[PDB]
Amino acid sequence: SAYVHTLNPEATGGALVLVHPGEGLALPYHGLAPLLPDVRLHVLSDPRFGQSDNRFATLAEMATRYVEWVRTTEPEGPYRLGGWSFGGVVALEMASQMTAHGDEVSDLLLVDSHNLNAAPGVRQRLVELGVDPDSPEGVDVVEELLHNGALAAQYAPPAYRGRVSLLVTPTDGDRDAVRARGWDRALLPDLVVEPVPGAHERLFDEEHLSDTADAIRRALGG
């Protein structure tokens, strides 16, 4: 569909599905493609983005719909899923569902994601992106953002035994980066924690993209 876009379509090194962050558009990930030229990148956008009505009721329901798309695009596994912040949380729930239905998910990439249901700026994020929150783009994005943040707050991530890479930016006061983001290592026995530099909101902007892509490449090459 119009919400699934595939980058590096002739790549033969494997595939990676990336779920949109809380703003709802997978466009930040497009700049990864030249930096991950051996990876088929399937980037997923929110199909309910423009719809004040007909939002997904739960993060689980969103994930279930995205799984469908993934299976249609890559009918055979093993699967590698991930996303930046909110998208990483959705990717986890996708991995949880796929593995419960017999699929192999060899990698799950949480790019500086947090678990708001455990450890809980809408307009200010756009201002920081250079968009007018009150422009036509602006209002839709803030609306999308607050809903996805509500989906995340109501969702608790389940125990998941597969391999999970959590890429973490610097943690205020250098405290434990896993608890600071609301995750419980008892639920993620095969968690691997990897550093990525810069600020949570800046990870895909022009300056940062090469370092963020480096951290993703390293996470996938276990």
Residue numbers in the entry: 1695 to 1814, 1822 to 1923
Question: What does the article say, verbatim?
Answer:
The NRPS enzymes that produce the β-lactam antibiotic nocardicin A (1) exhibit several unusual features. In contrast, NocTE is a unique example where a thioesterase domain catalyzes a functionally unidirectional L → D epimerization that expands the known repertoire in nature to achieve this simple but powerful modification. The overall structure of NocTE is similar to known TE domain structures of NRPS and polyketide synthase (PKS) enzymes. The NocTE active site structure with its catalytic triad Ser1779, His1901, and Asp1806 is similar to canonical Type-I thioesterase domains.
To confirm bioinformatic assignment of the catalytic triad, guide mutagenesis experiments and identify additional residues that could play catalytic roles, the structure of NocTE was solved by MAD phasing and subsequently refined against a high-resolution dataset from a native protein crystal. The lid region of NocTE consists of two helices (α4 and α5) that are oriented at an angle of 48° relative to each other and are held together through hydrophobic interactions. Interestingly, positioned two residues downstream from the catalytic aspartate (Asp1806) is His1808, which forms an additional hydrogen bond with the catalytic serine. In the unliganded structure, His1808 adopts two alternate side chain positions; the principal orientation hydrogen bonds to Ser1779. In the unliganded structure, the only contact made by the α4 helix to the core domain is through the backbone carbonyl of the Glu1829 to Arg1903 side chains. The loop joining the β6 strand and α4 lid helix, residues Arg1815–Glu1821, is missing in the NocTE unliganded structure. In the unliganded structure, a fourth water is present that is positioned near the β-lactam carbonyl oxygen. The NocTE active site is a fairly open channel allowing entry of solvent molecules at the active site as revealed in the NocTE unliganded structure. The crystal structure of NocTE confirmed the assignment of His1901 and Asp1806 in the catalytic triad with Ser1779, and additionally identified potential catalytic involvement by His1808.
